[PDB]
Design a protein around this ligand. Structure first.
Ligand SMILES: Nc1ncnc2c(CN3C[C@H](CSCC[C@H](N)C(=O)O)[C@@H](O)C3)c[nH]c12
Ligand SMILES: Nc1ncnc2c(CN3C[C@H](CSCC[C@H](N)C(=O)O)[C@@H](O)C3)c[nH]c12
Lengths: 230, 230
């Protein structure tokens, strides 16, 4: 089995990169792919850069060159569910764009022409993720994760998302793009992130302080998940 | 020499596809690529689907499989510049995301981390496209084109774009994502689109009525430009 992992930032992939045995690096299209074994399992870890287009480009390359059986998207997120604290885990059961709007032609808000309104994560991946959270005794929320090309920092940006997607448990900037690419290539996908901030007026400060903690916890989950899937 | 051409919709690529000699089709990742000769010049034409992610996925696949020397993005657009009427031509000198916002971390509005604030179109491609405009006797504006994952339909959506990007001459949903991917692969890029609507409260009705006109005019431009380039 070959597991694909994608993260956006250096801080989000660096801990996992260090655990890869017999690691080799490729650079292409501004993305770095690190291949090798993580605790015996073949992985390919991509550092995509930030936002929807950087993620889609990275995901397409990973699929085409490394042909993984599944993809796991890791890193930080903004917490929207009230029970979430910094460091806690969020797992996607679904992803939607919070900033897509073709409602003039009668599409659902967030839906793009030719796409489902939302991309459902793979049930088996979700089940395995849940079993890891339980084994590690971590606090987690499963649900809808929304993505857009905006860092959410309270005020109107946050209000708009809460209004349009009241069931969204977290916000980030890459997940739904990776889900979209995976849908088109029919490859199983899941998001396993950790909370760096709660996307409010303090989110820029919380994010700076807690990105490292979010990277540490998401890395813990992802390596536990890789081990379970094998 | 091989010219890459990317369009989002069936209507925007059907006229050009019908003119390809020795036409071979490839399907992958939800996208169709048609390869062959267009009046003796080798081309690869991709039908991407709609929006930033679909366009990025599409562009990445074209660049990887077909290795084109340049990319031309064609199709329709929403006119913003006062002199544009339905069917008139817009040529990118630059593209920017109108919906990207990481200003909380000090970036310019529309800039994503790790990216320039705008992507400059290739000077040689622009000059060729200006000679096509002249040869075909068309009305055209060269300028900033902005992209986002929304169909612009008047109200506050339009006011926001006009305020943030008062020099934008047109708006659409794919161009900047393609410019971004081309940037990352160091491939020359230009947008050559035709106006289907003026992005106001009637833009959805104007689009339905004038998509075929915009497609015909952009096709005329693209066929000419391919010849000029070879
Ligand atoms: N509040 C939030 N809104 C959107 N995304 C997130 C995230 C997830 N990712 C974190 C990251 C934030 S943008 C980082 C910019 C960075 N400080 C820089 O200056 O380059 C982007 O890849 C999305 C955590 N909190 C968020
Ligand atoms: N006013 C406008 N706003 C944003 N983009 C455009 C465009 C260019 N593209 C045209 C196309 C509009 S979305 C088509 C919806 C389609 N009729 C449907 O019902 O599935 C998308 O690829 C962006 C023309 N006018 C625009």
């Amino acid at each position: 089995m070959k597991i694909g992992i994608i993260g956006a930032m250096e801080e989000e992939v660096t801990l996992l990169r260090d655990k890869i045995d017999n690691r080799q690096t490729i650079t292409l299209g501004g993305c770095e792919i690190y291949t090798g074994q993580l605790n015996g399992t073949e992985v390919a870890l991509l550092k995509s850069g930030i936002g929807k287009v950087a993620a889609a480009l990275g995901a397409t390359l990973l699929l085409e060159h490394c042909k993984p059986d599944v993809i796991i998207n890791t890193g930080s997120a903004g917490g929207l569910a009230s029970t979430l604290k910094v460091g806690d885990i969020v797992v996607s059961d679904e992803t939607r764009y919070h900033d897509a709007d073709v409602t003039a032609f009668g599409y659902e808000y967030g839906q793009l022409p030719g796409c489902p309104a939302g991309f459902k994560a793979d049930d088996k991946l979700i089940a395995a993720a849940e079993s890891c959270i339980r084994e590690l005794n971590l606090n987690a929320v499963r649900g809808l994760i929304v993505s857009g090309d905006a860092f959410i920092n309270g005020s109107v940006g946050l209000a708009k998302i809460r209004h349009n997607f009241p069931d969204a448990v977290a916000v980030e900037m890459e997940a739904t793009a990776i889900a979209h690419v995976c849908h088109n290539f029919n490859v199983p996908f899941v998001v396993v992130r950790a909370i760096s901030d709660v996307a409010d007026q303090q989110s820029h400060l919380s994010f700076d302080e807690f990105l490292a903690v979010a990277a540490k916890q998401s890395t813990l989950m992802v390596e536990t998940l890789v081990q379970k899937l094998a």
